[PDB]
Amino acid sequence: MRECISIHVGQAGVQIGNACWELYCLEHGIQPDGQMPSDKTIGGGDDSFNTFFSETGAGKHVPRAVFVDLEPTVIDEVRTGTYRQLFHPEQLITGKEDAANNYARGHYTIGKEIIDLVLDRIRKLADQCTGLQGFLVFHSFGGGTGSGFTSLLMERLSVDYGKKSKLEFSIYPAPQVSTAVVEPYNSILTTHTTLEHSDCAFMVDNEAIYDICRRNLDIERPTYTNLNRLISQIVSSITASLRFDGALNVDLTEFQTNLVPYPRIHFPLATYAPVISAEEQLSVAEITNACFEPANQMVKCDPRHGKYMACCLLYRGDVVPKDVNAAIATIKTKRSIQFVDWCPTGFKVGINYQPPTVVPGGDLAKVQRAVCMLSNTTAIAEAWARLDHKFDLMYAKRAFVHWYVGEGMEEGEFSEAREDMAALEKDYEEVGVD
């Protein structure tokens, strides 16, 4: 057993973290006070769920997590909410004044002053680990904290935990819910500074989640609470292999091995099904087919018009291999699934037999079987092209640049970040198009 530390940065990171830990408690039979009656080893152990939870003598199961935000109102909701007793104050870090949607403010001006405290709190968690595998880092692209503080943190984690893996869950900006015109800037600045430091990053476009909530959950105007419940299901599907017994994706290194053959192209597409409203049960073939439908993806884009480098199917519930194989056969003859020439055309499959857990009085119906597909396709680069074009339109007139320069950033950091992104778009193109 090797531990994983989760770090939740800024509003989106923290609020998604609170939804994930709540769901993790429900999947593992951990109560709000941290008690877990099914755990028969009091005060410790090396079960699979101990990757995510430590234990106290009194039998409390404590998330291996840190929450950081540059203003206090989000993390105060963690301190007073349902799962408050899970956490101790050292895990919860707040400043007084936020980054005002400005990467430079998060990274340089305020980042400089709180980074050491954050690293101390993470080290207290690291020191209780026998074999820390690494970090899962949750943040927005668009916020000043989620963008600017995260990139600073990622750099300092490479320095202090050089052999450790780092995975991201990153919220890509969407105008129907975004709070800042400058989000493209923030997204590009943080992607440029973080790219060398992250081994695998799962991007979730708020646009896609919003649309799934509207179309499949019949919510007219999704809130963050609705979005975060859905996001946490996908996150849980991805981390299940670390927290339950299994032979697939059982450590963070294997995420890279199995999904990322080229270090810069480390952004797998997640597709999830089924999403059914809590106000008619789908077969293995149906849910697997649904993984090739753009409407179920976490980022809207067209995989038919790129190439796959890897594909992992993560099932939960009543699924047996024979049904998976028959469904793969079917779908191969109906669909445009082209791998690059230097990778095998194939699927890694994991099945966990416990169905998905739903949050009581959530929007999501209980199902008998669900699947998350992680595919590393070049089609996800469509999302980089969208953002880069937005960046270009504003940067050409230097709109809003003075805000960043005024926090002590140099203007050349913009064009350097941008150039890095143009080389990324070109990398995807070379891998992906004949």
Binding site: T109, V159, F244, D245, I351, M409
Partner: protein, 57 residues
């Protein structure tokens, strides 16, 4: 179908259809802080010039 592993909690397998520095960070942050300090000193200088004109009027 390769690498079939089974336990009580599930199973996993593979289907193949076809083969083929602290100091540099410190420095960057401090250079930015120095640029913030410079722009602030330029501003206080300009404000001081205004105070002088006020006194002259």
């Amino acid at each position: 179908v390769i690498e079939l592993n089974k336990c009580t909690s599930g199973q996993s397998f593979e289907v193949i259809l076809k083969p083929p520095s602290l100091e540099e960070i410190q420095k960057k942050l401090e250079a930015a802080e120095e640029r913030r300090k410079y722009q602030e000193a330029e501003l206080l200088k300009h404000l001081a010039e205004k105070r002088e004109h006020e006194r002259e009027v």
